[PDB]
């Protein structure tokens, strides 16, 4: 229909995107002011109306997309499903889930990432990096779990505040891994009772920082490459061979054209 | 005129640059001594004259450039505008701005960066890197802002010193992000009152350190490439294709010359 | 024999790997629950039987591999020797070694790395990186040892808790290197007695962080390359030229084909 | 002469290097034991003789090199001059210098770096990296110096322990830059008196960590490349074009051979 064709290009406009962006920025600002409890009841009830106004503009925007693209088409995008769920969960009377409350209205500012393409591409790159840093994250999860059981068994009886149980131990080890007070605060006290506790903790620190760093560098590097490669496909429309693939074959392609040149010289010299 | 031609090459000399450099180093040293309040009034009034002497030599230097290059030409360089504003703001009787005082005379040592070309190129590289780390810095700004609102709402009532308001929360979160006392100092105390506060803080730490690192690596990498690419254009005078562009097309250029070689072999074999 | 041929492909199946994986995950979980001392004697003796059950399934699995591959063949793999020693040391009545006890049953979860190929490849990459970060690790070991002797001689008499002996000094320096309370906790106190101790500690910090970082970046970079290069050999079966070798010769190979093209043009123009 | 020819190849042997290495390791160990003040006077005077024995073996070794290579030839190597000065300063009766004492005999273990080629190459790479991280280190030195003057002027009157003078301020800022207690320990206390001190400190932290990281990554990256490039020249004897030079011209060399191939096809098609 003509209604769904005109809707679509209204939705695809820069000023429509800019209207939605200023509505996200407005809802963000009013939720930030709402943290001020020194405000008068008049001001508090005023900002809650600005919140409802912002929320209804999103219900309108998301419904206009569902109509113009279809249910099959709108839900075909991960960023549209996120944009939907953000607004869809704001209209709910206590769903059957083990949550305390859905008072995280400020998670609406997260829509700024999806609405702004530059940030949507940046986040997108980091999301695609995660699968190819799955084995390292798993190795790190094993290393902690073994360290959490060891620490609870070794020190939970003498230092129950920090190694009282397995949950407590996972927390203290996360702290020791972030080098936060690990020595003056944890290991030095533990060492008075257990004089060789450094045998356990220095290797835990060495191992977890090498892995966390390998996990982070792995994400930052792949995401930076994925982003540039997506920009080339978005500009030229042609599929972009990943740089690692180009590098792994660079040797093969140079020695193929070395032999091709020498065999052309073979036919040329003898004529 | 001949006056503007001789001026220009005096200004473009190595010993003129070296004179200005020793004047910046002299003003820097006298401002550093001026921090000593144990000095006698004779010594204090002596150093303030050395400061005025240094400042007038800059008024002379900057005026000689304005004449020899012109207003259109001198203000065409960003480094010359900075060199101008540094001296121009030192001759001002309380401008209409919300500043406390312009007692930051030591910001004159910043001219050492502009006067010394090696450092002017190094800083220049970092300035050009910033635009292409704009999306990440924006993502980080959103992540804090959401975390600042969440922390003020969750903990500002029980721990007002650290999450009393939104400003206070931005500060504590910056501290938690720099891993500074985050656990023994902030989260462990918060956890006595709110037993699951780690659900909020460990992901905040994980997320903000991955982004800050991605923001820093993005700057350091692009700046290092931009600097080397500018050095090639400064040496050869020819435009330098950015390394990312060379890498993204390396595959295409190798398979083009593979086909070109094989098609030349096609015409050669059949003759 | 036909028994050793059928065994081998049972062992090489995905569901056999998945059975062993769920047995490792089960033994891991029961060892984690065993850390709970609030449990009843009935529950404690129940989990120890689940532990023995898991351990016997590994004795069966490892014996089935020893038979189907042979002793010469099974012990030809480093990952199989590790898988063997993990189970072989669990059946031992106090071997002649200077250990306290072999109560580290949770080191069985380490088999998840070997049993899961994705993680076995990830760890494998880090193990192969170590030899080519041997010189840096040695430089770091020399730097500490000299710093440990210097600190014990300078400060062990005045601050015996931290520099009492050489062992104590190695520990405090490891702490200072991880920037843990180095100033408010160690150097500031030391400086009251020895006003220029910063001359010793700031360079120690500068030097050890540059080396530890060079040691870590060296591992993370080589491991990431080794892993990708092993994946290419595993996919194509052909030997993969290391990227550093490709890069060091890239110049030579381009100027060889430049000359080969120009010499073919030499024979072509004159015909 | 024949004496200088036989000496030279004794000195160039692997077992001569191994003898010197075990003498360095022996002197290192005896200096480490000498830190133990609980030792008996018999043991203390025994180890000082082992120290003199080690020192004389170095006087013999260094004199054998001076004779076999000459003074012009021996002092032509930076590693030989270091090896000389290490031993030459151990035979000195209080030279005219502003030092406290030359009780740093453990700086002899530093000879292990020079004597062992693998480490001598590793250190060598880091030394050659320094010049090309000179501009960044200078930028960092300017940033601190300006921050040291600003902090002393702003806070030295209210917080003299930390910003009492310019020296004191350089130290506190180095601490704030290493994120050591910067907030709970320095900025939070300072903020009670000066409520907007975070305006000064958060940017100081942001700026100094980006630069220190750029300074460190710059060293680690160039040193890793310099080392691999020196290994290629040591293996092949041919000069190695630096990877940055190869990369900056890779585009030019590919489009030169693209045109050379197409112009050969031009002459081939028309024949
Ligand atoms: C296309 C980009 C990419 C990459 C990649 C990224 C940047 C630079 C060079 C390659 C990669 C490659 C292998 C890798 O190892 C772990 C997983 N093994 C399959 C992890 C990331 C990728 C993404 C999804 C799937 C498969 C590859
Ligand atoms: C130049 C060497 C290199 C590479 C590389 C090596 C060989 C061939 C092609 C690329 C690389 C790239 C991405 C990668 O993804 C890991 C993702 N999950 C661990 C892993 C290795 C690298 C490594 C770290 C930093 C900068 C370059
Ligand atoms: C010419 C250097 C450069 C680069 C660059 C730098 C180093 C190595 C390889 C490329 C770059 C490329 C894309 C990027 O992604 C974010 C912004 N997308 C446009 C950020 C930096 C640049 C500078 C200004 C403008 C456009 C590119
Ligand atoms: C070799 C892979 C690589 C690249 C790269 C990938 C593909 C094609 C061409 C270059 C790269 C370069 C600069 C870049 O700029 C980001 C600026 N704003 C996020 C982002 C990716 C890289 C990444 C990190 C470290 C070292 C190399
Ligand atoms: C095959 C991968 C590899 C590498 C390597 C790794 C990644 C990228 C580029 C090269 C390497 C090269 C030299 C190096 O320097 C110290 C030791 N000098 C021999 C350390 C690692 C290696 C592994 C084992 C042995 C020899 C090379
Ligand atoms: C692109 C330059 C580069 C290289 C490089 C340099 C020249 C030729 C070929 C590769 C490199 C690679 C691996 C390496 O292994 C060190 C292992 N033990 C110290 C050392 C240097 C590098 C360095 C750091 C990060 C990302 C790339
Ligand atoms: C030959 C290695 C090298 C490099 C280099 C190192 C690794 C990878 C790629 C290049 C380099 C290049 C420019 C640079 O920028 C600052 C100084 N500008 C001249 C700093 C280091 C060098 C060493 C001494 C002198 C000149 C170059
Ligand atoms: C692949 C891009 C890249 C490069 C690079 C860029 C263009 C052309 C050739 C190499 C580089 C290399 C060494 C360098 O030396 C700095 C020394 N003093 C600041 C600076 C830039 C890089 C950067 C950081 C990490 C890994 C690769
Ligand atoms: C990737 C690593 C993941 C680490 C996970 C941390 C453990 C999570 C469990 C947890 O922290 N608590 C849940 C239990 O209610 C509450 C805490 O309060 C408690 O664990 C202790 O930290 C202290 O209360 C004892 O001093
Ligand atoms: C990128 C992250 C940017 C973080 C920005 C930090 C917040 C800035 C506001 C601020 O810190 N103050 C301005 C208000 O005067 C003063 C502080 O003193 C106050 O916020 C608190 O830190 C304490 O005083 C309470 O314990
Ligand atoms: C790569 C760096 C390797 C550092 C190695 C650290 C030293 C290991 C020795 C050690 O720490 N102890 C063994 C001796 O029993 C026990 C400790 O308790 C003692 O050294 C002191 O830390 C305190 O007890 C004194 O305040
Ligand atoms: C690259 C950054 C370089 C930083 C350089 C640090 C300053 C060096 C001077 C210095 O620290 N002292 C020399 C003066 O004797 C002694 C110290 O004891 C003093 O400065 C203070 O730290 C405290 O004593 C006051 O609380
Ligand atoms: Na820290
Ligand atoms: Na602390
Ligand atoms: Na700390």
From TrEMBL, chains A, B, C, D:
Presence of the UniProt keyword Coiled coil in the record: no
Primary residence: membrane
Start and end residues of each Ion transport domain: 14-231
Entry keyword set: Membrane, Transmembrane, Transmembrane helix
Membrane-spanning ranges: 19-41, 81-101, 122-147, 197-221
Coiled coil: none
Subcellular localization(s) per the UniProt record: Membrane
Cellular-component GO terms for this entry: voltage-gated sodium channel complex
Recorded topology in the membrane: Multi-pass membrane protein
Keyword S-adenosyl-L-methionine carried by entry: no
Superkingdom field: Bacteria
Any one GO molecular-function label of the UniProt entry: voltage-gated sodium channel activity
Pfam families reported for this sequence: Ion_trans
Stored PANTHER family: SODIUM CHANNEL PROTEIN 60E, VOLTAGE-GATED CATION CHANNEL CALCIUM AND SODIUM
Protein name as it appears in the record: Ion transport protein
The species this protein was found in: Magnetococcus marinus (strain ATCC BAA-1437 / JCM 17883 / MC-1)
